[PDB]
Ligand SMILES: N/C(C(=O)O)=C(\C=C\C=O)C(=O)O
């Protein structure tokens with residue numbers, strides 16, 4: 001049977017969920033309990049964390065524009081996601097998505113992680129670029145598994161202290 005229901009109009013679905021594609025929620029998973037994690041991410045949202053995903057991520061920027069701060073080959077880089085752009089991110093490429101536009105919408109597709117395949121979330125020093133803090137997580141549920149992790153980093157000057165230059169990371173926003 002059609003466990004995930006029948007086909008449905010995507011632009012209409014996005015419009016109808018527009019109130020959830022803005023702060024404080026910012027995103028919405030389309031189907032529940034599926035192998036493919038299909039999410040629409042709106043805006044505005046900025047962030048300071050870099051994700052280390054052990055699997056690929058697919059992006060299709062449907063509405064508005066966004067960009068990904070990356071680390072590529074030891075250097076800091078930016079991949080722009082202009083409206084209409086698609087992108088496939090390889091495993092383990094550190095990325096920090098920035099979505100400054102209200103009313104933007106990006107289709108993001110990931111896969112469920114098998115037991116033992118962990119995700120990393122990392123912060124880097126604005127002053128010297130050294131890794132400041134990394135947490136590895138078995139990522140089941142995104143909604144419960146991630147906010148406390150981010151909160152506890154922002155709450156602690158110890159966690160936020162660069163081990164190489166002692167500069168304390170701004171936490172939630174530079
Ligand atoms: N599903 C999350 C994830 O990759 O952990 C991604 C969604 C990025 C949206 O811009 C992200 O934060 O990189």
Ligand SMILES: [Fe+2]
Nearest residue numbers: 125128162165
């Ligand atoms: Fe530093």
